[PDB]
Amino acid sequence: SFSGYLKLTDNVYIKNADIVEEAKKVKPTVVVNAANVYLKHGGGVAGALNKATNNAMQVESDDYIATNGPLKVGGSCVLSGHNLAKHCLHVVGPNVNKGEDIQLLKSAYENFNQHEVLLAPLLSAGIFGADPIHSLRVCVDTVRTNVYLAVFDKNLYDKLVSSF
Numbered sequence: 001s002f003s004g005y006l007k008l009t010d011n012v013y014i015k016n017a018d019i020v021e022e023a024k025k026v027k028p029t030v031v032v033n034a035a036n037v038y039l040k041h042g043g044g045v046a047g048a049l050n051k052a053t054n055n056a057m058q059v060e061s062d063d064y065i066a067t068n069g070p071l072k073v074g075g076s077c078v079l080s081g082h083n084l085a086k087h088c089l090h091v092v093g094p095n096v097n098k099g100e101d102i103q104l105l106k107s108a109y110e111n112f113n114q115h116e117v118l119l120a121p122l123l124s125a126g127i128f129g130a131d132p133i134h135s136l137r138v139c140v141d142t143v144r145t146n147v148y149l150a151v152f153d154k155n156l157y158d159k160l161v162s163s164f
């Protein structure tokens with residue numbers, strides 16, 4: 001199971017870790033990807049997870065988009081987890097650097113409630129431009145299932161914990 005996490009609430013836990021390395025160690029049922037609507041996994045969490053799959057995630061994703069079209073901001077889809085997890089839940093948080101509505105962050109986190117346990121990043125953090133402290137608050141106030149959050153940056157992790 002998951003190891004070395006700090007308990008934040010009844011159902012939310014946090015660790016200073018690269019989500020990709022955590023997925024390789026744990027091989028969880030569900031790993032969350034910080035996706036965009038096109039499932040173009042270029043950088044951040046998505047680029048890192050895709051690289052770890054040897055680009056198989058991107059090939060699968062391109063076929064999904066060719067069939068279904070883009071996701072919605074706030075939406076998700078379940079695809080394979082490849083070598084990292086049984087499933088990858090690709091969740092689109094709003095990208096504030098693209099002008100997307102930050103109120104869609106709660107909708108994005110609601111997708112987590114469809115899964116009993118998830119390994120996940122903070123949505124809309126990092127290159128998506130939102131305040132990670134706000135993202136953690138929305139996570140705790142929205143997700144009811146068991147969420148193991150991996151935060152790569154140690155200073156941000158320490159700030160998240162000490163201001164919680």
Ligand SMILES: Cc1ccnc(C2CCN(c3ncnc4[nH]ccc34)CC2)n1
Nearest residue numbers: 017018019044045048126150151152153
């Ligand atoms: C202020 C600041 C500075 C540097 N990085 C960050 C973010 C980057 C995205 N991120 C991740 N957290 C967990 N596993 C991950 N794998 C790849 C990215 C990633 C959370 C922290 N924010």
